[PDB]
């Protein structure tokens, strides 16, 4: 498929959102990303 510049930005963001909760936030809050998406198991929009 041929992705446009806008689609690319969105995919880009989705990839970034697909990261973990940094270790320090765990400490800073005396102690989970409910939006973890797998390329295979999940399905993005568009």
């Amino acid at each position: 498929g041929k992705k446009s510049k806008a689609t690319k930005k969105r995919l880009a963001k989705l990839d970034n959102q697909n990261s973990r909760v940094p270790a320090w936030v765990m400490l800073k809050t005396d102690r989970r990303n409910h939006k973890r998406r797998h390329w295979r198991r999940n399905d993005t929009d568009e």
């Binding site: 510049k5 690319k8 995919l11 880009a12 990839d15 970034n16």
Partner: protein, 81 residues
């Protein structure tokens, strides 16, 4: 108002282009053309830009690979910052 140059894209591959091809890589604003990236660079570093190659990265930012003239030396330029 948005600025053209965001910051230097420093990575191993960026170094090779710098040490071996007199090229500097930058993260630039995605609304910037090669020509604008060229000027901005010459102005911010006082050098002569020969060629500019761009790429819209999977990071949401636009990457520019800028080649300097033989007069200038990428390594030396990158060092002052």
């Amino acid at each position: 108002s948005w600025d053209v140059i965001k910051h230097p894209h420093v990575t191993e591959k960026a170094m090779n282009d710098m040490d071996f091809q007199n090229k500097l890589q930058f993260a630039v604003d995605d609304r910037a053309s090669k020509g604008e990236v060229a000027d901005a660079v010459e102005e911010q570093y006082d050098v002569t830009v020969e060629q500019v190659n761009t790429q819209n990265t999977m990071d949401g930012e636009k990457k520019a690979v800028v080649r300097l003239s033989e007069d200038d030396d990428a390594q030396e330029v990158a060092s002052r910052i």
